[PDB]
Amino acid sequence: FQPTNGVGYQPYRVVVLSFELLHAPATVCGPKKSTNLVKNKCVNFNFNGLTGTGVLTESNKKFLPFQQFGRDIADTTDAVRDPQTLEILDITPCSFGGVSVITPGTNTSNQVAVLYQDVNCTEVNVFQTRAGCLIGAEHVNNSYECDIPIGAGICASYQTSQSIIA
Amino acid sequence: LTGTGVLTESNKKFLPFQQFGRDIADTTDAVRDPQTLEILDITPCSFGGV
Amino acid sequence: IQLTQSPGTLSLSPGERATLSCRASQSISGNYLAWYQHKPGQAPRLLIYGASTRATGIPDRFSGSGSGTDFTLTISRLEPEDFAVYYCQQYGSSYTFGQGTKVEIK
Amino acid sequence: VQLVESGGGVVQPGRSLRLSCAASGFTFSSYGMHWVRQAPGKGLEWVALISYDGGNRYYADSVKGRFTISRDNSKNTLYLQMNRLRAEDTAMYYCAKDRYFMDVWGKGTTVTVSS
Amino acid sequence: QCVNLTTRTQLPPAYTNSFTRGVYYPDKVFRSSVLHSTQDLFLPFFSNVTWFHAIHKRFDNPVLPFNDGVYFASTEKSNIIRGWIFGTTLDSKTQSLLIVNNATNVVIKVCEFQFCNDPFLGVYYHKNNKSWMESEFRVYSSANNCTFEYVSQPFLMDNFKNLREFVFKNIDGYFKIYSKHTPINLVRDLPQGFSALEPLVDLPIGINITRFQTLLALHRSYLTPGDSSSGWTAGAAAYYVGYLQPRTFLLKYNENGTITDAVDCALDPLSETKCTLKSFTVEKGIYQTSNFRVQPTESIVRFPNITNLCPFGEVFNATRFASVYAWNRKRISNCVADYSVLYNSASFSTFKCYGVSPTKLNDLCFTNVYADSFVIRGDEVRQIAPGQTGKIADYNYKLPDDFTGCVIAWNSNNLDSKVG
Ligand SMILES: *[C@@H]1O[C@H](CO)[C@@H](O[C@@H]2O[C@H](CO)[C@@H](O)[C@H](O)[C@H]2NC(C)=O)[C@H](O)[C@H]1NC(C)=O
Ligand SMILES: *[C@@H]1O[C@H](CO)[C@@H](O)[C@H](O)[C@H]1NC(C)=O
Ligand SMILES: *[C@@H]1O[C@H](CO)[C@@H](O)[C@H](O)[C@H]1NC(C)=O
Ligand SMILES: *[C@@H]1O[C@H](CO)[C@@H](O)[C@H](O)[C@H]1NC(C)=O
Ligand SMILES: *[C@@H]1O[C@H](CO)[C@@H](O)[C@H](O)[C@H]1NC(C)=O
Ligand SMILES: *[C@@H]1O[C@H](CO)[C@@H](O)[C@H](O)[C@H]1NC(C)=O
Ligand SMILES: *[C@@H]1O[C@H](CO)[C@@H](O)[C@H](O)[C@H]1NC(C)=O
Numbered sequence A: 001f002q003p004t005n006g007v008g009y010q011p012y013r014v015v016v017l018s019f020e021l022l023h024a025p026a027t028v029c030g031p032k033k034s035t036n037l038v039k040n041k042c043v044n045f046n047f048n049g050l051t052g053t054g055v056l057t058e059s060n061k062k063f064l065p066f067q068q069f070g071r072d073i074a075d076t077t078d079a080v081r082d083p084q085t086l087e088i089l090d091i092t093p094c095s096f097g098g099v100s101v102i103t104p105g106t107n108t109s110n111q112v113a114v115l116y117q118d119v120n121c122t123e124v125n126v127f128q129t130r131a132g133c134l135i136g137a138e139h140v141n142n143s144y145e146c147d148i149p150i151g152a153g154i155c156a157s158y159q160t161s162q163s164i165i166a
Numbered sequence B: 001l002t003g004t005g006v007l008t009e010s011n012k013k014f015l016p017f018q019q020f021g022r023d024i025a026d027t028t029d030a031v032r033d034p035q036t037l038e039i040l041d042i043t044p045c046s047f048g049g050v
Numbered sequence C: 001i002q003l004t005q006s007p008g009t010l011s012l013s014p015g016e017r018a019t020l021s022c023r024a025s026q027s028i029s030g031n032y033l034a035w036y037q038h039k040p041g042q043a044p045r046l047l048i049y050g051a052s053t054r055a056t057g058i059p060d061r062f063s064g065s066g067s068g069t070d071f072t073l074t075i076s077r078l079e080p081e082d083f084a085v086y087y088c089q090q091y092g093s094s095y096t097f098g099q100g101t102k103v104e105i106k
Numbered sequence D: 001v002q003l004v005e006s007g008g009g010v011v012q013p014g015r016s017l018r019l020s021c022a023a024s025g026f027t028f029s030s031y032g033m034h035w036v037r038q039a040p041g042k043g044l045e046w047v048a049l050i051s052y053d054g055g056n057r058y059y060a061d062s063v064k065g066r067f068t069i070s071r072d073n074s075k076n077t078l079y080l081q082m083n084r085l086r087a088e089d090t091a092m093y094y095c096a097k098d099r100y101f102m103d104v105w106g107k108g109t110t111v112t113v114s115s
Numbered sequence E: 001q002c003v004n005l006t007t008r009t010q011l012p013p014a015y016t017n018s019f020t021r022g023v024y025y026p027d028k029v030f031r032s033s034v035l036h037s038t039q040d041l042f043l044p045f046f047s048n049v050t051w052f053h054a055i056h057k058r059f060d061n062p063v064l065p066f067n068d069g070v071y072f073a074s075t076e077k078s079n080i081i082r083g084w085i086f087g088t089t090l091d092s093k094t095q096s097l098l099i100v101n102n103a104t105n106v107v108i109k110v111c112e113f114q115f116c117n118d119p120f121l122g123v124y125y126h127k128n129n130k131s132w133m134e135s136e137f138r139v140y141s142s143a144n145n146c147t148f149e150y151v152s153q154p155f156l157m158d159n160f161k162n163l164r165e166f167v168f169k170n171i172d173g174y175f176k177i178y179s180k181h182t183p184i185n186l187v188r189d190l191p192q193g194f195s196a197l198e199p200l201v202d203l204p205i206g207i208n209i210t211r212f213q214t215l216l217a218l219h220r221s222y223l224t225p226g227d228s229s230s231g232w233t234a235g236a237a238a239y240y241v242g243y244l245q246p247r248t249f250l251l252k253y254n255e256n257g258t259i260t261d262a263v264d265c266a267l268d269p270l271s272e273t274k275c276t277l278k279s280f281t282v283e284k285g286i287y288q289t290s291n292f293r294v295q296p297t298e299s300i301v302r303f304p305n306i307t308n309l310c311p312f313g314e315v316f317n318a319t320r321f322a323s324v325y326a327w328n329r330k331r332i333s334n335c336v337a338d339y340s341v342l343y344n345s346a347s348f349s350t351f352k353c354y355g356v357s358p359t360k361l362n363d364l365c366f367t368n369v370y371a372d373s374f375v376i377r378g379d380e381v382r383q384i385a386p387g388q389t390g391k392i393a394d395y396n397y398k399l400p401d402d403f404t405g406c407v408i409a410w411n412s413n414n415l416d417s418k419v420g
Helices: E267-279 E339-344 E379-384 E391-395
Strands: A011-020 A042-047 A050-058 A070-071 A077-082 A089-092 A096-104 A114-116 A128-131 A132-135 A148-151 A154-159 A163-165 B007-008 B020-022 B030-032 B039-043 C005-007 C009-012 C018-024 C032-037 C045-050 C064-065 C072-077 C084-088 C101-105 D002-006 D008-013 D017-024 D033-038 D044-050 D058-059 D067-071 D077-082 D090-099 D102-107 D107-112 E015-018 E033-040 E049-051 E069-076 E080-088 E096-102 E105-115 E140-150 E160-171 E175-182 E197-203 E211-216 E237-245 E246-251 E262-264 E285-293 E298-302 E327-334 E352-353 E366-376 E407-410
Touching: A050 A077, A096 E267, A114 E285, A132 D077, A148 E285, A148 E407, B007 B030, B020 E015, C005 C084, C018 C084, C018 E267, C032 C064, C045 C064, C045 D102, D002 D090, D017 D033, D017 D090, D017 D107, D017 E379, D033 D067, D033 D077, D033 D102, D044 D067, D044 D090, D058 E246, E015 E237, E069 E080, E080 E105, E080 E160, E140 E197, E246 E267, E262 E267, E267 E285, E366 E379, E379 E391
Parallel strands: A042 E298, C009 C101, D008 D107
Antiparallel strands: A011 E366, A011 E407, A042 A050, A050 A089, A070 A077, A077 A089, A096 A114, A096 E285, A114 A132, A128 A132, A148 A154, A154 A163, B007 B039, B020 B030, B030 B039, C005 C018, C018 C072, C032 C045, C032 C084, C064 C072, C084 C101, D002 D017, D017 D077, D033 D044, D033 D090, D044 D058, D067 D077, D090 D102, D090 D107, E015 E049, E033 E246, E049 E237, E069 E160, E069 E237, E080 E096, E080 E211, E096 E105, E105 E140, E160 E175, E175 E197, E246 E262, E327 E366, E352 E407
16 A cells, blocks of 8 residues: 555545345435325335335225234235334225127127126216126016127126117 | 249239238348339249158 | 608707608508618718618617608717718619708707 | 629720629529629619520610620629720629629729820 | 418318238338248338328418337428428427428428428529429428538329328437328328338438428419418318337238239238238138237335344455455345445445346345455456466365356555555
8 A cells, every 4th residue: 555556556435325125114314205105096005115006095904013914824914004104004006807808790880888897887878787897787577598709697698779788 | 131032023013112012921022123014923932741 | 753851960969759750752662661771981880771670789769650751760868979970762663762860969 | 602703994985895793692693783883983784684695685775776785604703794994984894693683793893094 | 591380270180091001011021922021110000190281271280209219201292391300309409300392402400400380492483594493491490400411303293193202210329211202182081001111311410309290382373462471372282190000010022023912911900910910911820820918017125124224334444455365254144235336436446246136236146245345456356266277266266167156356556555
């Protein structure tokens, strides 16, 4: 360590920062303002660095004073404790489901009905069934032979002026 | 654009802006000769099991 | 088309209002009447065209009015830089100029 | 937007003199060009105009038959050929660009008709 | 050369639906008897397009935006529309694109232009060359910062017996143009049908475009008064403007290779079904085509409401440092730190991070942070890394292979060197 030393032989001050993600209350955070919490809505949440998408609701899950996060069978987050107010909030993934189109052949009509599978007629001539929310098919009291199967005992067909009925 | 195949005459009417053709597999079906603006079909060389 | 300007000489002081007149021997077509400023040793500078349209860069104390054979150039509050000779011009039938009015300091 | 005149000087009465105007900084070939003169201590007097394409020309009554105006759009020049000059033609001759009126004026060339 | 044109006839803007128009060959590939699905900036079907008239004195040529693209169609019989203008401000302060069509030729320039309000091409007679010339100096006054020029065959060629449709795009550095000429007899509005636009050019202008304007021609034959907002008459020529959007289309191909039909997958669930089944015909039955998912509306950020700064100053700007064999360790906890300022500081000659980048470090919380500090020489700095070997990494300071953090170093010759 002489001033006339080559650069490879000159002194260098080294600082090594190591970050550990112990599953614990993360105290060292980087400068970020918190926001208000919105319940019963689909939101993209961030709790102490843990992120995800879901609906945050009130819960009756009695976490122990040392417990901060809950997990499901799949090891995904089930519930969190709000870092500002020590309450337990359940995380329910936002409503989703398959979309099926119920239609007669294009050789007959270009009118279609849309079935939203395994959802309620909320988030979406609307007929609620146990298969999902069926929109566009008229609910008819008269029974007939099954034509285009939907499920759970409900079938659809193109009949009478003509329209899709369920 | 490189490949192996038999180059033959074709009756495929490429548009003035079209230079290459492609098959269902996205492989080259035909090309326009860069020197003489004619369309040549590309047929992979004969093959089969023994 | 002969343009006769009046008066021949106007003697005023800064801050006052100047009225310059231009009379044509024949009616000017399309209000094609322009006004020009000339300071000693300088080329003319356009002030007004279309009888009432101010040229680019000309301050709003200059305004033009009139029609037919009788036109007026008004300077609402004279500034020292405004003391100069003023020529009117018609450009509807050939191109002819007035004989000029000198605006001098009283 | 600049006009520079040239060709001024003294000329004996009856002889000829050609003035030139070099243009730069604007689309010269799209503007009509005028000549204007001003005798010492007197008013402005229009002399001649040439159209942007050189097809049409007009002259002041006092110079008809004696003056000829021309232009060269490839060289951005306008010329005024002044023949059989009289002592009453002594003046500063301005080159000016049509906007009609003239909105760009040259500094002028002094022409003195004297023996 | 810069005369204004301010005839005052106010009429409200009209709107029309583009049933099936604006389809263009996305690539220069030949396809036949095949259905192909591609995502690209297209004009959605039955789209709400504006309508502008130029009939008599009603003239419509305002400055319109160029958000992502344009579908420009024109029903003409006299070639009144000569070209367009593209740019942000359309003044000498910025570069702008120009496209104009002379008889049997095209002029394209990318200069910094100074357009006057309500530009247009002027037509007159010249009395020499004996031919009505078409001087273009009415559009722009001056042309500075020219970088690009290009000439080619007419883009526009010959009530309304012909229809000219154009598609403009401003992809990364290329201005792409697709065109088609279709003859039709309809006189009111767009003819419902189908026609694809073939590509024409791809100009590498490489500029930023947000606004655009159209160029038309005027007729002053029966009489000519002095240049003013008068003495002009415009024949019946109208144009429609539509903005493109990223859309997934399903394209059809015939034997010849022409499109002749297409489908917008997001138009309706039936189109979703057709795209899912890769066919324009759907058999009777029930098909699963997509998935409904509720999207989040806002983010929720929650952290403990504590207020303290991590003492990085006494770690980095420490007066003296430790030997590498007895390297000091500082444990940082219960504080808030800005790694962005640390990374910003150029005092450091080495700043390598592992398993995480510093730019994405000032928004992640950790339970503990350890700050190890020591002094080594230049050629040994490279040994401070996971999976390195040497006298320092083996006997003095060893980093794990699963290390998550950053290694920072700087030359301290002015502080840690003695004359002797
Ligand atoms: C092209 O120009 C537009 C506007 O001239 C730019 O839009 C601006 O982008 C900046 C991004 O820093 C915003 O702060 C401004 O508010 C935007 N302007 C407006 C009016 O919204 C656009 O970014 C430019 N494109 C590029 C690639 O630089
Ligand atoms: C539609 O079905 C009828 C018989 O039901 C058949 O004759 C006809 O060809 C079909 N349409 C098409 C386009 O094939
Ligand atoms: C939908 O929500 C309502 C509450 O308004 C409930 O009564 C109904 O049973 C729900 N249906 C399904 C299928 O969940
Ligand atoms: C079916 O019949 C019941 C009673 O007979 C009636 O309440 C119900 O509204 C009927 N459904 C429809 C779709 O008309
Ligand atoms: C088009 O816009 C008008 C209002 O500008 C609106 O009334 C009309 O419904 C729109 N049409 C479509 C198809 O969105
Ligand atoms: C564009 O013109 C300006 C003059 O305002 C000049 O300074 C600049 O260098 C020009 N651009 C280039 C690339 O030379
Ligand atoms: C394909 O083109 C040929 C001639 O180029 C034409 O005869 C034929 O009809 C076209 N195909 C169709 C389906 O029209």
